[PDB]
A paper describes a structure:
Multi-subunit SMC complexes control chromosome superstructure and promote chromosome disjunction, conceivably by actively translocating along DNA double helices. SMC subunits comprise an ABC ATPase “head” and a “hinge” dimerization domain connected by a 49 nm coiled-coil “arm. The heads undergo ATP-dependent engagement and disengagement to drive SMC action on the chromosome.
A structure of a Smc middle segment, designated as BsSmcCC2, comprising residues 246–379 and 793–929 connected via a short linker, was solved by crystallography at a resolution of 3.2 Å. The BsSmcCC2 monomer comprises two ∼120 residues long α helices (designated as αN1 and αC1), whose arrangement presents the knob-into-hole organization of a canonical coiled coil. In the middle of BsSmcCC2, residues of αN1 located in heptad positions “b,” “e,” and “f” are involved in the contact between the two coiled coils via charged and hydrophobic side chains. At the top of the structure, residues of αC1 form a similar dimer interface. To establish whether the organization of the BsSmcCC2 dimer in the crystal is compatible with the cysteine cross-linking pattern described above, we mapped the cross-linking efficiency onto the BsSmcCC2 structure and plotted it against the corresponding Cα-Cα distances (respectively). The excellent agreement between the crystal structure and the in vivo cross-linking pattern implies that both datasets faithfully represent the architecture of Smc-ScpAB complexes in vivo.
Numbering used by the authors: 250 to 365, 808 to 924
The structure:
């Protein structure tokens, strides 16, 4: 009977040796659970800096577009500036044509008016073509002066060219900004939260791995005192 409950004490060794084999299977459930999470974190991390890179593309396209937008606004201002001058000048030079042919009609008449000697009236005939020719070209020069306004006013419709260009830097970016900045900030929270699971689960297992440190040593004596007493009797 004395030994009958010597071994009935060794039954607890089976409990501890079972609590071990039950506990080591509690840790590895998490050393691959974590492993599954580290393969998720890998994926989540890839999407962010792919997205964060895609966000950098529009920054290259606009800052290249801004150099194209501010450039055309200069042209838009420069062309309207020339157009205001040419249309003023053409009108100003058109006035010379008006004053031109007003002097020529009086010239032919006045020289003929005195004629109603004659050489002094033909001295106006010389003054006729003198006034006529000096103001014949100005009637034709301002005509071609309008041709520079036939190029500028149309160039102002190459300013509309910027707006058409711009809306492809907007609705391609604005539809892209809601496609990038919405997702890029949203893809991050999944990344950080996955790291927090791992950090906890790793800490959750080290508390059992420290539990295992005690449990695995307690057996070495349980199996020694029993072994040293088994050699006694």
């Amino acid at each position: 009977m004395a030994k009958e409950e010597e071994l009935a004490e060794s039954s607890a060794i089976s409990a501890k040796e079972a609590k071990i084999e039950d506990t080591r299977d509690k840790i590895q459930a998490l050393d691959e659970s974590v492993d599954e999470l580290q393969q998720v974190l890998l994926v989540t991390s890839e999407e962010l800096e792919k997205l964060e890179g895609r966000k950098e593309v529009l920054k290259e396209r606009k800052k290249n577009a801004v150099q194209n937008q501010e450039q055309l606004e200069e042209a838009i201002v420069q062309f309207q500036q020339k157009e205001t001058v040419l249309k003023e000048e053409l009108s100003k030079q058109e006035a010379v044509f008006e004053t031109l042919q007003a002097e020529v009609k009086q010239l032919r008449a006045q020289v003929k008016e005195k004629q109603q000697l004659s050489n002094e009236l033909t001295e106006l005939k010389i003054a006729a073509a003198k006034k006529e020719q000096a103001c014949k070209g100005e009637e034709d020069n301002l005509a071609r002066l309008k041709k520079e306004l036939t190029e500028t006013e149309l160039a102002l419709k190459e300013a509309k060219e910027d707006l058409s260009f711009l809306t492809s830097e907007m609705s391609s970016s604005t539809s892209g900004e809601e496609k990038l900045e919405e997702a890029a900030k949203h893809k991050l929270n999944d990344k950080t939260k996955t790291i927090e699971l791992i950090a906890l689960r790793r800490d959750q297992r080290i508390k059992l791995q420290h539990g295992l440190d005690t449990y695995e040593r307690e057996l070495k004596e349980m199996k020694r005192l029993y072994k040293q007493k088994t050699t006694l009797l």
